[PDB]
Sequence to fold (1013 residues):
Amino acid sequence: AKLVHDVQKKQHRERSQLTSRSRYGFLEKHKDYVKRAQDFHRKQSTLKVLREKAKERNPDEYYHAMHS
Amino acid sequence: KKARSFIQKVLTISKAKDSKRKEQKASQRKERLKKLAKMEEEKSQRDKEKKKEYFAQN
Amino acid sequence: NPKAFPLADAALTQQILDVVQQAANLRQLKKGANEATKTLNRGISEFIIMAADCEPIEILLHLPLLCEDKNVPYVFVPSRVALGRACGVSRPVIAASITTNDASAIKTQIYAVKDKIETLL
Amino acid sequence: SPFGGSSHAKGIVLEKLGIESKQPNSAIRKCVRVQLIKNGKKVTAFVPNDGCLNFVDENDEVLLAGFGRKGKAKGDIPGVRFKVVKVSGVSLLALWKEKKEKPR
Amino acid sequence: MNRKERKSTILETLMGDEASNKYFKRKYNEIQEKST
Amino acid sequence: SKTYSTPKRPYESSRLDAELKLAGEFGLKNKKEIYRISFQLSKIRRAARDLLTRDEKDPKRLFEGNALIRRLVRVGVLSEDKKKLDYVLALKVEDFLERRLQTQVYKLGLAKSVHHARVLITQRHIAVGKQIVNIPSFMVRLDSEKHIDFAPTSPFGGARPGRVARRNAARKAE
Amino acid sequence: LTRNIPQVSSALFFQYNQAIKPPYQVLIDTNFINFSIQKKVDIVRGMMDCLLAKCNPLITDCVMAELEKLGPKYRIALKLARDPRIKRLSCSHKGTYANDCLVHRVLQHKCYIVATNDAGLKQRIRKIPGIPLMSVGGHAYVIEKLPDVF
Amino acid sequence: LTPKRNKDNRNSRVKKRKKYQKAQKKLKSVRAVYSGGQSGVYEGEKTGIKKGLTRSVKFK
Amino acid sequence: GARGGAKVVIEPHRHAGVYIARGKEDLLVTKNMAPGESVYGEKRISVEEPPPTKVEYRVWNPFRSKLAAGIMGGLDELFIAPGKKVLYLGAASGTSVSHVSDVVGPEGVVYAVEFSHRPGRELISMAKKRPNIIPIIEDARHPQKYRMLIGMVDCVFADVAQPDQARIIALNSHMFLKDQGGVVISIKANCIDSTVDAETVFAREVQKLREERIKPLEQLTLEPYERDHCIVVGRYMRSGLK
RNA sequence: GCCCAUUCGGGUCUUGUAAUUGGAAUGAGUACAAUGUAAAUACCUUAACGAGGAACAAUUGGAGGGCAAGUCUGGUGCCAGC
Ligand SMILES: [Zn+2]
Fold:
């Protein structure tokens, strides 16, 4: 706070989900969006790295642990 | 069964207590990091003022 | 070699018991033998005084073994009735103690008395 | 010293410099063109708090003072040496915290 | 400690009193309610 | 007059913790009280330094040092045994401001805290013998240390009870 | 596994250091004696004029070895620092290095004040908390962080 | 149009008291200050003794 | 807390000889040499071992013993190992010497000296019970009149209450302590100098030690248990001091 | 749950929030009266009043945040800045 008022930095409450669509409720704001989207990006990236290893499987691998 | 229920209760209290203590310590570690960032930025600009005040005697 | 060896003479007696009366008016004194040994084995004791003419002498001679073990000075005084008049109480108290307190305005006189009686012993 | 010997100089505002700056409370928004009277010249003063920029409009007989930055800021412009401390008799700090009232 | 209270281990010693059981039941129930 | 003086730097960490400890320990109001007591301590031991740096057996050093130690034992900050001049050089601000009336009536008892001591002796209750003192910063002399008691015209002594007590006695006897 | 974190020495406040009672113990060192001479101030009377209190100076065996080691230009300094008014410590460590001898000696006691003049020693001393340094200046001394300079 | 100021900030004697008794309780976390000693009977050290920790300043 | 009847585990500590007694609140505990009898009224753990045998342990009350506070504050190493010989300057009564005795064990000995008389008869009446200690009722300022009965101790310890602390420990350590041997002293600031304060008197005493050829290596303050004492641990070098 | 130290470490209910709440003491004032004074004010006294948000309302600065179905600028989506 340098040169502002407390009424200049009052609180903004957030509006609810409409009762007209209350069956599939809980309107989903920006913080919940970014917490969804970064999770989806991480899942897609790990799916694409295992897909890349599958496309380069190298079909002649062998260890002692593959007997049973 | 009394002892097993008691030990399960003690463990499920203690791991959650230590969990939120850890996340609180991490939360305040973030503000300590931001405070050190402001301090190093101010110190770096002060020293880059001083190192040319040391050369303006030329 | 009697059983009450560090017996104080007259002028040291008068200064230790006017320090006694100042402590009694400053609420810093414990009166009596068993409260003296209770505060002694609690630890809060600047120094303790006994009277060398109680009719059994051993009922306060049990205090040397506590006090010179827990490293606190102790002094005999030749009159239980004078020590009672010093403590400011009707019956003659025979064993007084001064508690330790760094929020008391007789710290200088207490330390002067304690240095004098450590030189005496 | 920065204007003869005085520490403060009365001045006449020409126009609010940068009303069309879109970013609110910015350096190019918080400037005015003051005509210094003591030698009759132009200068660019730096009124704090754009929310209290709009007290001063036009020839409001404003009273300037130096600025003296105590560090380095993010997007502050250099060149402005003068801040507004009093406008038309009253002090605009007291005006912005709305104790007094600007007289006209 | 009383002879009818000296249990065989500190687990049964901790079960033997009341305030610890009160705190454990309310804290554990609040933890299950917070997890659900 | 100008008793108090600003120190050689007022914005410093060790000085800030000094004023914090002294203020919260002896129950003080602002930095001006520590600065007044510190100033007059500095003045009297700056005067003591010159009497030390000149030679012994000078009449100036002899009876002016006797004057200074008589004044300091009269205030009470110097014990009865160290009656020579360099203990005045070894004086300290703590046992110099300890003799103010606030700390002194707390040490005497009768107040149960330093802050309660200050608020009652500014609520006009403590009188040194005969004179009601309503100011803390007194520096009570050594001779009148045992004349501190509640004043007789005050309801912690033996006067009429206060207005709160008698108003509550009225509207609790109704 | 023994870690060792030294406790903050319990005669210290946050940074007030109430252990420095007015009869002081100072730690003289080498270029402070040299600068005291080439500013022509005294030692004991100079410290008394700066601190208004009786100061007992100390020099260590490491600093005396440094003053002997610095050759014959500072025979005035060595004749001055063999003063019977001062006392003398006795160090036991390897390597006569006045800087780490001084800063070790003071950071394990927190009761000495350090009378130094060189830049690195002043930096380490004012880096570690709550011990006052003094130094020469103009024609007198100057204290850096004593809580009662006056 | 002022910030909400403080009842502690009103009287300077109070603010220089509630700053001290906080800083009195602050340095129960940098040292271990003397707090009277053995008050009751010895109920153990009551808060944890660890083996691998030496809080002793050593002589270089 | 820690009432009589709880079950407490007995874990070993770094300093061999002592043990941590971890219950719901912790204790410091030494393994008792003569079982069945407390010496100054402390509580005793009592474990059973398998012919069924039963061995007991004593707690170590740090508010009434000196070096227990140093142990709990955490010293880097003592020299009171389970085999050494330990001299005890200023053995007041059984209240600490019994703890140093049963730390030392059945092989090593503890020579406990004492100047006063009534603590002397209490020390002897305790000393008849366990055999690994030697009570001496002589002044610690004269180590040439009990030179007849002791020899070549392996660590000295000091609690005497006299302002010639350094001279006492220097004379007793020159007369008895072996080379490269330990010396653990416990200075009381208000005892040995009332005028100047704690850190100054500690630095003066440790300077007197390193003049008397004890190279010190540890200083601890033991502040939460006693006020303004200090534990100073040192070696006795005598050869290659630096 | 608190607090401290470039980080992992250290230490502590003997730590914070609650009108849960109780009575005691007051002078700012207000005021008979007397006092002072050329007369009068002020102070010094003082009966009767005079406190809980003790609202009988202490300020001046400074450092940080955080919040929207909001606004604006830039771009290598979901971002960065003001
Ligand atoms: Zn050295």
User: Anything to note?
Assistant: Residues G 60-62, 91, 93, 101 surround zinc ion (CB under 6 Å). Residues 36 and 56 of chain D are 16 Å apart (CA to CA). Helices of chain D lie at 92-96.
